[PDB]
Design a protein around this ligand. Structure first.
Ligand SMILES: Nc1ncnc2c1ncn2[C@@H]1O[C@H](CO)[C@@H](O)[C@H]1O
Ligand SMILES: Nc1ncnc2c1ncn2[C@@H]1O[C@H](CO)[C@@H](O)[C@H]1O
Ligand SMILES: Nc1ncnc2c1ncn2[C@@H]1O[C@H](CO)[C@@H](O)[C@H]1O
Lengths: 609, 4, 6, 609, 610, 6, 6
């Protein structure tokens, strides 16, 4: 855990950094100007106030300023005041403080969102961002609960929980979803419901702000947190936010190291996650193994998965037990064709499956990649021998010497058919015996609507020259989605079964009942596949095969985000389209508000046949 | 110390 | 690249 | 009136086109395939039906096909059928018919919008538009009233007015607001309210469909129309749509020339409109006289407005009468300073005013344009003489030899301050006497929210290379908006008064109560100006100075349209921003949903000081 | 030094890689297919040859392939053969070998440029680069001396552009391939070296490796590999570029092991200033010229200014000399010299003025004008804590400030890499009305210098500076502050623009550069010299460079299309310093030997904001 | 160009 | 940034 101390009083700054680093904090949120030093910018004599306006640069080194200090905007700066003089002084002072922080090169700046209307603050911030070159992040300091909702019931004659999120949403929408504007969330004593926290966790939260007043004390007098607070801390610790501790020491008998020590205690109290580490919210282009040739280092991460090939070997083992009785155990030889044999792993899985099933197989390893044919043929010379026949041909062009009993393939993508498993297996179906088996015999794709401001900003950041400016929103992305909110349960899109003894063009309509209020940002695509009868591989988040990491989910973005209310069903439509030369997907949201069909004619993304 |  | 992505 | 005949039965095509032309119709809407000749594309034996599928190309000349025939889709083609075989056959047949119409080079093609779900139709159309090169227009045939609401109440045991507009809106949103997809509106017997007709009038209506069944019968027997229908025909004739007559001749005693002759009769019974003709929905860019030197033709366009210069002359007349009493007539010389003298129509207005007021003036004609100074100095040498002193300087940097009693300028734009009248008159008020007058005395800008889908497509079509791909939405456009819908009444944005004796930066928040469900597309800006006491020039659509075409409205687009419903209030913020170098505008919609702030730091549009 | 071993015989890949890394090499250049295993691709029966075509990719780890192996094209592959059958087979086999190297993820691939016509080689490589995704670099193996010019004179009836031949080969190859980033040079150094200007043209090229046969090594009195002094000088020049040295051939000194050829190169690497230490990490790295007038600099930007002590030593010495000159020793204690430091920064030039007046024992009343409101904070904390009433800190622009009195000396620090690209003339123009009529400006004068350069790497860096949402070729119309390192300078610098203070700042210069080599012009490098006071100068011109003074890198003005120049052909360039009330910019155009367009018309791609 | 526009 | 460059 990495954490900081928010101080509003820094009498001398080097002493304060010393006293803050001794007690374990990693940065310090401090005001660059004096919080009570109101400046005047328009009227004399106070406009011409002499002397320095703030502290010198030279009190800390450049590395100290760039790494250790998070600036704060002064509390009197009120750019959305109803008084025009206060409003203009606050615009000028906000610009002065932001420019001084840019000059100091602070890594972050902390600005407050403590009311509904922050339009002028948004304009001054978005004009600072587009002026000059600077690299500060802007952590907008927004609470979980509005300050007028957690006040005591003391006054005798005087959107409830979705309120401050709408403050933040309006702010980040006025600033046009800037990459440099994020959230510093204040966690008070009164936590909101669970679905409010999910929207909050789908946002750009770089910091969490924990007052020392929300800490409750134990029998020994230390600061601890309630179980609901601890659960919120664990969810935030999954996002790797930093924790800012504000307020005074409410447990005076101890010292201020105790709050931080409790946070580290919860930090230590907190294979797919290890593999996916470093790839979270990192967009990738989906593989196209039919139109491109894969590097050996691409095949290595395939063969790094033991669960998928163990499941394939189990499916082949059960199929070989079914197709050959114990009486015909030796005089019956089953023809297997591994289609797209890769560098070996399905051929080895088939050999092991026939070895543990105690059945005889004649195996063909078909592979179009000549560079993988090199390693397949070295395997064949060195290990496999005459049992395996290595074919350097496309399965759709190959002329088989004899028909097959089982054809086994691994041509499934993250959305189960974006790597042309239907077309390839339909081409390879003619050398299958009339009672032959295809492994996998079944696969379905699943879609769920998601919200993620970070994923949307990465998709925008994928905008490239020499290209349509919104082609990036018409491409699926293989992404280990991490900082997102899923709006509804997944629901099956497309189903393909092999062999097909009957058109791979598909049209699906999916209605997702959204029981909460959200802002739809895209769709996540998963898949399930039945290899043989009860052997399945799934990346669906409720049926996910444990320990399997060969497939990250697919993201289908949408060009503009769609604001969704509670009780509003999201109706989306997906097409699997094709021609003689290429296959693509088209999608469109039709309810609650329509969007354009994304990727028409495959103009931004096709899969090459 | 860390006990709830 | 990992998870069937380039 | 350009009008067409919609036939669904064409036995011979040349004879029918001849008869249609004899009746007086300009085009003919006809089915390219036989409407009853349903075709199979998937199942044998009917997939292999021999012979020609339709008529020959050679039955009409090429120019006949490209100028005379509007194609129709066959009525059995339902791409959004719930039966998969029907909808796949209908996708294939719709593709076949659209490709045959593209091959025939038809100018237009009618497709029906007669049900709520038209997503697969939209996808097949969007894929046709993006496949191949072809330039036919697609007229989506949508009714004013849905057919389930026009049915008689004769069944014993068995959103109202805004249904089919939402059909059209969903369709055009799925197809991404294409320039090639427009509306053919069916006007039935029962006619909707006035505000339904206003959204419809804001749409790309290229044709209007008048069934012969909606025509009333007079005492002589000829077809006529109701008063509400006549009003709708007049509002559509303002848009220059083509009227399509459908159905059979219900007035069998008369010919079918009578339905056309009534429309010709209404056509022959329907200065600013003559000037603005040919400029409707044509986006210029606002002039910048301070940063760019104008042309002779620009000034000539200015000086063809007699109303504005008559108004300036009346203002100077009244000011000269006020500032000099009759007894001090021959001894008091009033220093007038014409700032930005142009080629000299304001100087002539001042001289004619001083003659009409019968007062003695010493006039200065300041002009920074070195090429209009040539015209001014030839005027001075020939006509004006020593009364007028021509200064070739900026009014801001010019050092006067005396103070001015009156300063007169024409520095106003379509938004009253986008040509930097405040900054120019600010630097030109130090050579004004302490009781000096400025004409114009003050000026206000007014904003109204508008919907116009054609204007949104025009702004999209302004996407220029080698710049931000969405920087065309952050520029005001001088536009004679014609095909639009004004959502609410104009409200004042910014007011500047001269002389300023007390910052030209401004901030306005305008809340527009909308009483109708609409889709906000931009903000139209007008201005009013008080030259002298009761002398005003206005381009506001209610207080417009009659026949005064100096200024078109200004248009501030928004990047994505904002859907609005009844009872909501559109809240928008407008900022006038400046620095030492530049002046610009920033805008953002804050209610009902937020938009981004448009033009931050003047990144897409500044006015040069 | 990083060094590799070129082997054309790898009987076992793991054993050979172990033995190569045992004796100190960092990579191994080896054939991925057997060099003699000629494959057939068109004609039967040899087209249908069975078995693996090459050895497996599972013999080394993936990281071993990605870091330790440089692949070689097979010697029989001649894609430019005059026989069509050999040409087609060699195209197919080139593609197969390149694709297998991409499959292996090799970091580099060696291809030979051993003949004049390599157009089909260039086409097959250009098509490989534009196909699929792969990251391998392509090292074109080109000799320093052509193979037909190294042969012995032992043919009785065939006795033996001579030196500029293989560079012409490489130039044609990389011009056909459109100056790819992924295509570089592996230079073969032979026994007989060419002239020194031939070696300069090569040193301005993307050389990523140097190939040293063991046959170019001489022998000691103790019997060890060594190289001649002309070879050692070539090695020392190549060590500046940080190339990798590839040892080819067999052990020609068989008494000692093959480690000795490597040990000599390690010896020479261990036997080859502060500017070079400061400039590391910044060589051939384009960055934008600073614009302090219209951009407020950060504090870390000022920190690297104050990190140069030589510039401020020189300013203090100039103020010292001026103070002695303007005040006689008899009038020492009663004359107050009003100094004005214009653009005072965060302090260092005011500190130089104070130290100068202390060592001159003179009395000064100093004004520190600065428009940066965030550096005024530093200046005013300086004044409160140290300076006191001697220094008056002004938060204004020198051009609009109203001084309470006139100055004796104005001192400014407004010089860029090209001496006027930061509007020092325009700023000091508006700061002359508060200078006394005998008043002195420091710097007194400054001149900019230009020299024509050649650099393929700089040209590719400028192309890589293309941005979206702007003119696709505007990157060639901006100057770049660059520690230009991998470049060839075609002629001596000549003075471009001179400004002198106190004094139209629009300028027009024509410079004719005599060329004595046969190169391709890529841009002009601009330097400056400034006279602060009498004999106190600051210069970044590479002949008169102030020692250890790293405040300024050279400026670079590119040209959109390279201009091929031959010997005895002067290059005539013309520079304009243009301006209006709002902006100042530069325009340039080469007019001889071949005209180019005027670069940056109206400042459409680059202006300096007033 | 008409209406104060180019 | 060094050598008067950003
Ligand atoms: N049509 C095909 N014929 C043979 N191998 C294929 C085909 N399509 C994909 N593959 C291979 O299938 C494996 C998994 O996608 C990869 O090795 C890929 O090269
Ligand atoms: N600062 C200025 N000084 C003089 N004429 C001006 C100035 N700004 C605009 N104009 C002139 O005003 C007229 C209308 O804007 C034009 O003739 C234009 O050239
Ligand atoms: N016109 C100006 N007036 C005052 N300081 C300036 C001016 N132009 C540049 N400077 C300052 O000069 C220094 C250039 O190194 C910077 O501190 C910069 O802020």
């Amino acid at each position: 855990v990495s954490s900081g101390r928010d101080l509003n009083c820094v009498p001398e700054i080097a002493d304060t950094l010393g006293a803050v680093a001794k007690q374990g904090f990693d940065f310090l949120c401090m005001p660059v100007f004096h919080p009570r030093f109101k400046r005047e910018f328009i009227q004399e004599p106070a406009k011409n106030r002499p002397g320095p306006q703030t502290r010198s640069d030279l009190l800390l080194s450049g590395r100290d300023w760039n790494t250790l200090i998070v600036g704060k905007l002064s509390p009197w700066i009120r750019p959305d005041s109803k008084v025009e003089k206060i409003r203009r002084n606050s615009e000028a002072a906000m610009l002065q403080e932001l420019n001084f922080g840019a000059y100091l090169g602070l890594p972050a700046f902390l600005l407050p969102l403590n009311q509904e209307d922050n339009t002028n603050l948004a304009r001054v911030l978005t004009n600072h961002i587009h002026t000059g070159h600077h690299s500060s992040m802007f952590w907008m300091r927004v609470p979980l609960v509005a300050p007028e909702d957690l006040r005591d019931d003391i006054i005798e004659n005087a959107s409830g929980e979705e309120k401050t999120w709408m403050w933040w949403h309006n702010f980040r929408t006025l600033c046009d979803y800037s990459k440099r504007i994020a959230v510093a969330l204040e966690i008070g004593a009164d936590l909101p419901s669970n679905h409010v926290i999910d929207r909050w966790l789908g946002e750009p939260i770089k910091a969490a702000i924990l007052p020392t007043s929300i800490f409750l004390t134990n029998k020994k007098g230390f600061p601890v947190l309630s179980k609901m607070h601890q659960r919120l801390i664990f969810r935030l610790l999954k996002l790797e936010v930093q924790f800012i501790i504000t307020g005074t020491n409410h447990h005076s008998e101890k010292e201020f190291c105790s709050y931080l020590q409790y946070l580290e205690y919860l930090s230590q109290n907190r294979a797919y996650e290890l593999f996916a580490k470093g790839y979270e919210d990192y967009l990738q282009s989906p593989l196209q193994p039919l139109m491109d040739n894969l590097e050996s280092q691409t095949y290595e991460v395939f063969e790094k998965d033991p669960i998928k090939y163990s499941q394939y070997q189990q499916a082949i083992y059960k199929c070989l037990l079914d197709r050959v009785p114990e009486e015909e155990k030796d005089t019956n030889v089953q023809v297997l064709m591994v289609l797209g044999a890769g560098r070996g792993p399905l051929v080895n899985a088939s050999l092991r499956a026939a070895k543990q099933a105690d059945r005889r197989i004649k195996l063909y390893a078909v592979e179009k990649n000549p560079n993988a044919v090199v390693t397949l043929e070295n395997w064949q010379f060195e290990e496999w021998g005459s049992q395996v026949t290595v074919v350097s041909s496309d399965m759709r062009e190959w002329v088989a010497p004899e028909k097959a009993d089982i054809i086994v393939s691994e041509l499934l993508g993250s959305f189960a058919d974006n790597e042309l498993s239907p077309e390839c297996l339909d081409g390879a179906q003619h050398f299958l015996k009339d009672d032959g088996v295809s492994i996998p015999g079944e696969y379905t794709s699943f879609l769920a609507p998601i919200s993620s401001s970070k994923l949307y900003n990465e998709v925008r950041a994928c905008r490239e020259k020499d290209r349509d400016p919104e082609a990036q929103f018409e491409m699926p992305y293989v992404v280990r989605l991490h900082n997102f909110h899923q709006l509804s349960a997944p629901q099956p899109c497309f189903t393909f079964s092999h062999p097909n003894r009957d058109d791979n063009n598909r049209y699906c309509t999916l209605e997702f009942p959204v029981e909460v209020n959200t802002v739809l940002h895209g769709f996540a695509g998963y898949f399930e596949t039945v290899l043989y009868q009860d052997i399945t591989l799934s990346i669906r988040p409720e049926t996910h095969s444990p320990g399997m990491f060969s497939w990250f989910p697919i993201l289908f973005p949408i060009k503009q985000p769609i604001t969704v209310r509670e009780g509003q069903t999201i109706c989306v439509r997906f097409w699997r389209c094709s021609n003689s030369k290429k296959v693509w997907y088209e999608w469109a949201v039709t309810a609650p508000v329509c969007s354009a069909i994304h990727n028409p004619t495959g103009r931004s993304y096709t899969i090459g046949l | 110390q860390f006990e709830d | 690249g990992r998870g069937r992505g380039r």
